[PDB]
UniProtKB/Swiss-Prot annotation, chains A, B, C, D, E, F, G, H, I:
Phosphorylation at serine and threonine residues in S-P or T-P motifs by proline-directed protein kinases (PDPK1, CDK1, CDK5, GSK3, MAPK) (only 2-3 sites per protein in interphase, seven-fold increase in mitosis, and in the form associated with paired helical filaments (PHF-tau)), and at serine residues in K-X-G-S motifs by MAP/microtubule affinity-regulating kinase (MARK1, MARK2, MARK3 or MARK4), causing detachment from microtubules, and their disassembly. Phosphorylation decreases with age. Polyubiquitinated. Requires functional TRAF6 and may provoke SQSTM1-dependent degradation by the proteasome. PHF-tau can be modified by three different forms of polyubiquitination. 'Lys-48'-linked polyubiquitination is the major form, 'Lys-6'-linked and 'Lys-11'-linked polyubiquitination also occur. The record marks K6, K12, K16, K26, K35, K38, K65, K70 as: Not glycated. It comes from the Eukaryota. The tau/MAP repeat binds to tubulin. Type I isoforms contain 3 repeats while type II isoforms contain 4 repeats. This is Microtubule-associated protein tau. It is linked to In Alzheimer disease, the neuronal cytoskeleton in the brain is progressively disrupted and replaced by tangles of paired helical filaments (PHF) and straight filaments, mainly composed of hyperphosphorylated forms of TAU (PHF-TAU or AD P-TAU). O-GlcNAcylation is greatly reduced in Alzheimer disease brain cerebral cortex leading to an increase in TAU/MAPT phosphorylations. Frontotemporal dementia 1: A form of dementia characterized by pathologic finding of frontotemporal lobar degeneration, presenile dementia with behavioral changes, deterioration of cognitive capacities and loss of memory. In some cases, parkinsonian symptoms are prominent. Neuropathological changes include frontotemporal atrophy often associated with atrophy of the basal ganglia, substantia nigra, amygdala. In most cases, protein tau deposits are found in glial cells and/or neurons. Expressed in neurons. Isoform PNS-tau is expressed in the peripheral nervous system while the others are expressed in the central nervous system. It is found in: Cytoplasm, Cytosol; Cell membrane; Cytoplasm, Cytoskeleton; Cell projection, Axon. It comes from Homo sapiens (Human). The gene is MAPT.
Length: 73, 73, 73, 73, 73, 73, 73, 73, 73
């Protein structure tokens, strides 16, 4: 058996931006109150309170190319 | 058997940005209170309180190319 | 058996950014209060309180190329 | 005569505020013209002209408790 | 005569503020003109012209407790 | 006659403020002109012209407790 | 012949402005694309492309007096 | 011959403005596409493309007095 | 012949401005693309591409008096 696997990729993924700005992200600028009395936990607790895991993501490009070349004989 | 795995990549993934800026991230500028009374824990506790794990990510490009070349025989 | 594995890569992953700046990150500029009374813990406690693990990441490029070449005979 | 004056005060006066801001006070940004000719004052003059006695008052709390305990025999 | 004057105070006056800011006070950014001709004053003059006695007051708390304990026999 | 004057004070006046800032006070950034011709004053003159007695007061607490204990026999 | 040319000018051209501001001029914040193929020019070319010759003019007065005194004998 | 040319001008041209502001001018925030193929120009070309010659003119006065005094003998 | 040319000018051109500011000029903050293929020019080319000859002019007065005195005998 003869197999030729010769894909050719000449693609452009392109982004052009004049200006990118004046971006405001303000998570949890408010008021958070947690009051707990006489609670019973028989098993594990994970607790997050406040302003956690917030992201501001401002890439000047942020382009993605995902490319799988799989040959199975 | 003859296998010729010869993929060719000439791709461009490209970003052009003139200016990128005036970015504000203010997580947990607020007021947080946790009051706890007579709580009972019989197994492990993880607690995170306040402003944790917040990210400001401003890459000038931030482009990604993900590229898998797999041959199975 | 003959296997020729000759993938060819001439790609570019490219960023051009004119200016990148005026970036403000202020985690936990607020007010945080934790009050605990008569608590019972029978097993491990992990506690993080305040402003922890916050990130400012401003790379002039920040491009990624991920490229896996696997041949399995 | 026996007098017992035994009031007990356990009160809370409480204020909780997440964030307080972006406050603009601009007294007398306008145009003020006073033109006086041949006036006669036989008695005292007080004159205030322009932008006087303006207040910006931004307390983070600003709570008031006023409490009079008067016993007259 | 027996007088027992035993008022008991356990009060709290409390303020909790996460963030307090971005406060602008601009008295008399305008234009003021006073033109006076041939005026006659037979008695005292007080004159204030322009931007006087203006206050910016931004206390992080600013709470007041006023408390009078009067016994008159 | 027996007077027992035993007022008991356990009070707190309390402020908690996370951050306090970005405060701008600009009195008399304007234009002031006073023009006087042929005026006659027969008695005392007080004159203030321009930007006088303006206050910026930004205490981190600024709490007041006023407490008068008067016994009159 | 006697010619007496005695024009008298006591005029006032006057502007009084309290405050002048918050002026935004943003020419060419948009996107401009010029694509040219196989064009033939036998004589001179002037080309302007983009954001050119734009003016922001904010004079605090900006008054004009134009005054011609012509005597022809 | 006797000619007396004795015009007297005592005029006021006057402007009073309290405040002048919050002015936004945004020429060419849109999208401009010019596509040219196989065009033939036998003679001179002037081309302007984009956001050109735009004016924001915000005078605090902007008064004009135009005044010709012409005597012909 | 007697010619008396005695024009008398006592004029004022006057500006009073309290405050002048917060002026933003942003020409060509957008994205400009010029693409040229196989063009032929037989005579001179002037080309301006981008953000050229833009003006911000904010004089505190900016008044003009233009005054021509011509006597022709």
């Amino acid at each position: 058996v003869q197999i030729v696997y010769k894909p050719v990729d000449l693609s452009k993924v392109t982004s052009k931006c004049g200006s990118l700005g004046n971006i405001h992200h303000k998570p949890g600028g408010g008021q958070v109150e947690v009051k707990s009395e006489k609670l019973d936990f028989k098993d594990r607790v994970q607790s997050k309170i406040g302003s956690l895991d917030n992201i501001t993501h401002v890439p000047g490009g942020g382009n993605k190319k995902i490319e799988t070349h799989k040959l199975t004989f």
